[PDB]
Amino acid sequence: KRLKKRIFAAVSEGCVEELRELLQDLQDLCRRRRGLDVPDFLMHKLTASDTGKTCLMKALLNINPNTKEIVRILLAFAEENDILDRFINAEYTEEAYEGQTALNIAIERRQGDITAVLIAAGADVNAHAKGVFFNPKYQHEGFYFGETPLALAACTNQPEIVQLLMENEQTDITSQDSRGNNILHALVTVAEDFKTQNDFVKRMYDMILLRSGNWELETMRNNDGLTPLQLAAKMGKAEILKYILSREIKEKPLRSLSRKFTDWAYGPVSSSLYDLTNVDTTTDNSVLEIIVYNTNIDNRHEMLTLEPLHTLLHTKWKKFAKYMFFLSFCFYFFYNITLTLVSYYRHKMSWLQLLGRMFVLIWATCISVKEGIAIFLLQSILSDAWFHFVFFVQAVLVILSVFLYLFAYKEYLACLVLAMALGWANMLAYTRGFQSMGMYSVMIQKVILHDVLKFLFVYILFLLGFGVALASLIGSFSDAVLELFKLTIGLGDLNIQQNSTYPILFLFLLITYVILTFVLLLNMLIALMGETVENVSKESERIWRLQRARTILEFEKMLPEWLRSRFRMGELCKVADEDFRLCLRINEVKWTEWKTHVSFLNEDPGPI
Amino acid sequence: IQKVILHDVLKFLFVYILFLLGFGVALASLIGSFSDAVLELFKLTIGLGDLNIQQNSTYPILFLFLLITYVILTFVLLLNMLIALMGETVENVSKESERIWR
Amino acid sequence: AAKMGKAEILKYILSREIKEKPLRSLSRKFTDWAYGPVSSSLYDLTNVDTTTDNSVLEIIVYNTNIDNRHEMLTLEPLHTLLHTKWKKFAKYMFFLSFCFYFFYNITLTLVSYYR
Amino acid sequence: LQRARTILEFEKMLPEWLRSRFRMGELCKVADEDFRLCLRINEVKWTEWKTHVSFLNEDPGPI
Ligand SMILES: COc1ccc2ccc(=O)oc2c1CC=C(C)C
Ligand SMILES: COc1ccc2ccc(=O)oc2c1CC=C(C)C
Ligand SMILES: COc1ccc2ccc(=O)oc2c1CC=C(C)C
Ligand SMILES: COc1ccc2ccc(=O)oc2c1CC=C(C)C
């Protein structure tokens, strides 16, 4: 048993001669074991039974410059012993690291020739790794490359290994794994910005894709049920998503697997067709929908700047929602006027007094029904869900107050005033929907209610400290609050200063409160400017790009299907043989670079 | 910047006058008197209204609420247009001034 | 290094690791394990932590005369260890001290003459 | 500063036996005849790429 560990030590070192003679000793052990015929006696002596690690495994852990000689001897030892398939394709037995198959290790240790010999040995190169480490619940715990030796070298930027694994016979590029992912998913899953990662995730996405040659291995969906394009949306990885939409290929026999088809070019002017296979909302899950209806990811302002999203989003405003938002704006504007006039300022022939109150009741319900479902469908109060709360609350209190008049409880009038009060509050809520005027204010209403109230929570507590102090100078306590609030106004004067007890002490506590208020009110004035400059100033139009585009698709589901069927952007076009696609046309002009053109949708440039 | 300050302050004032008349009909419901309620609430911007006019006939607890909500929100809004004019009109209107001067 | 407050040398002390085998003992920031792009490390705590009467962290705190204390605390074995001591002790300790003195001021003003 | 000032100021206020429970880091062996209390921090790098030869352990994950 010491002899086994001495081998593991000889595994751990480059002692070539010491490694050889122990195998000569182990060969003599196999000779003396006649009855076993050494199937597993070879296995038992070369492997710790608790962990499943072998001699070839542990040698690939510890890399020395004598490692290549260790490999060629270990493979020479197994081949007389005829158990190399059992030897090389051994795997881990514990639930962590589960089935690692140290061909995986040599990829991770980046040894190309050592990898080539194991391929030349034949090592089941589509070996699915498992284990809690390879599929971690947390980011700090493990590393999720997607359980594939091919995808590992892809994820670890070793393109020659990606090249060398590419032309094996039983490679099976289309493989799936635990969590249901394909090789492109993990490439999306493991990606960052141009900071901290430089374009290899893009390029290794490209390099494997040219070998593919089929629309499948993008049409596949995971166990979550998502395409790599869909998973690009849900993960929100921006830099890969730019590459997907503008993926064009000049090289002829596989120009089919391409997007952004070049329509025509005539010198500095060209036109192009961006594909709409799954971007537009004609399908239940679309690219544009997932980017809108998620708050948890990040960075939604960046992704919407990208081109086939950006123009298509602009067109849907122009043909639908600029009419739709202005119409919704005018109806609720008439609704608030309809509330306040017939409150008490104004029943047989008086039709328009009665039909006016009827018009209030019918429209407030449909808002309350639609918002009541929508709130029940769903973090939230930071953006737009607190707003959709107030629309529902204001609608109910209109309905609730009139129903108090039916049961004649006297608070029907008082609840009616609160309903009309919040009716103008939601009238302020449409002011963000203009391009400019609400949006610098509304997102800073998020900020100015935060920063001034924390000053006011100081200041009201700063108020009541001085208030009980002067009340001790001889409800009168509530009157002392009202007296000291006049000092903020300036209404208190010299004659009220003529105290009964200690005029010298009463003269001190006044002027200390005056100056410190001038200290504090100047301080929040200064500190708001230095903090909210250029950060809240930019984040304002960020949410303006959000909450507009939020509502645009929210208007889109409100339209009927037959009227949607008229308004379909883009057009059915033929980019290749036996293919017909709806695509979006965008004209543009470049001047800087200059190239002759070989890829054409048409010969004739102009619109026919 | 008279081109600019008439644009940016009036859109605040078109909010604020509409922000005025919403509170104006609310306190008028607390018992032309409607035009007098505008003149009463404009005194609050001046500071002329005081404690004795607060002694309402109906619901003093509700009349105490609608005053102080208008005071703070006015201090919110008038501070907001003060901040937003500085961050927007810096260095762009400041350069475009001498452009038109040329 | 702490008392003089020389920052640039102090970064070299804490992350002083050596790959060269026969003297890898005289090293700090021991590499735990690495698997591709993910690695773990062990920063030593020979004299940094306050288990000894004079420690590195103590001298950086309890001096005003030197300079530049914001720079030195950005350094790594200080920075994480300082963050952990907030989380396991002082966020409970400061909030508890905050609530007692908050109750204390209310306890002062009420029984002044109101009751 | 003043946060981290008070943190160590709270530290001396604690008793020794309760401090003895809360000891950050762990006793580990980095070399022969050496045992040290050290702090573990995980991190991720992408830019440079090197094969690894210096190891505390062969097995990456927490056991
Ligand atoms: C009005 O159309 C919209 C609407 C929303 C967004 C949101 C993000 C964005 O970056 O772009 C957008 C556009 C395009 C604007 C123009 C001037 C072509
Ligand atoms: C165009 O109609 C609109 C417009 C705007 C809104 C705003 C919020 C909302 O929840 O509902 C709305 C509706 C639906 C009302 C009807 C009568 C179908
Ligand atoms: C709350 O933990 C603290 C406390 C104090 C300091 C002081 C200096 C410093 O630069 O870093 C600090 C941290 C670390 C914060 C995080 C979020 C890891
Ligand atoms: C946790 O206890 C606290 C909390 C906060 C402070 C603040 C300043 C101070 O000088 O002393 C303090 C103490 C010690 C009091 C006791 C009863 C042991």
UniProtKB/Swiss-Prot annotation, chain C:
<comment type="subunit">
    <text>Homotetramer. May convert from a homotetramer to a homopentamer to allow pore dilation. Interacts with TRPV1; may form a heteromeric channel with TRPV1. Interacts with SNX11; this interaction promotes TRPV3 trafficking from the cell membrane to lysosome for degradation.</text>
</comment>
<feature type="transmembrane region" description="Helical; Name=S1">
    <location>
        <begin position="84"/>
        <end position="113"/>
    </location>
</feature>
<comment type="similarity">
    <text>Belongs to the transient receptor (TC 1.A.4) family. TrpV subfamily. TRPV3 sub-subfamily.</text>
</comment>
<feature type="repeat" description="ANK 6">
    <location>
        <begin position="1"/>
        <end position="15"/>
    </location>
</feature>
<comment type="function">
    <text>Non-selective calcium permeant cation channel. It is activated by innocuous (warm) temperatures and shows an increased response at noxious temperatures greater than 39 degrees Celsius. Activation exhibits an outward rectification. The channel pore can dilate to provide permeability to larger cations. May associate with TRPV1 and may modulate its activity. Is a negative regulator of hair growth and cycling: TRPV3-coupled signaling suppresses keratinocyte proliferation in hair follicles and induces apoptosis and premature hair follicle regression (catagen).</text>
</comment>
<feature type="repeat" description="ANK 7">
    <location>
        <begin position="51"/>
        <end position="73"/>
    </location>
</feature>
<protein>
    <recommendedName>
        <fullName>Transient receptor potential cation channel subfamily V member 3</fullName>
    </recommendedName>
</protein>
UniProtKB/Swiss-Prot annotation, chain D:
<feature type="topological domain" description="Cytoplasmic">
    <location>
        <begin position="1"/>
        <end position="63"/>
    </location>
</feature>
<comment type="similarity">
    <text>Belongs to the transient receptor (TC 1.A.4) family. TrpV subfamily. TRPV3 sub-subfamily.</text>
</comment>
<protein>
    <recommendedName>
        <fullName>Transient receptor potential cation channel subfamily V member 3</fullName>
    </recommendedName>
</protein>
<comment type="subunit">
    <text>Homotetramer. May convert from a homotetramer to a homopentamer to allow pore dilation. Interacts with TRPV1; may form a heteromeric channel with TRPV1. Interacts with SNX11; this interaction promotes TRPV3 trafficking from the cell membrane to lysosome for degradation.</text>
</comment>
<comment type="function">
    <text>Non-selective calcium permeant cation channel. It is activated by innocuous (warm) temperatures and shows an increased response at noxious temperatures greater than 39 degrees Celsius. Activation exhibits an outward rectification. The channel pore can dilate to provide permeability to larger cations. May associate with TRPV1 and may modulate its activity. Is a negative regulator of hair growth and cycling: TRPV3-coupled signaling suppresses keratinocyte proliferation in hair follicles and induces apoptosis and premature hair follicle regression (catagen).</text>
</comment>
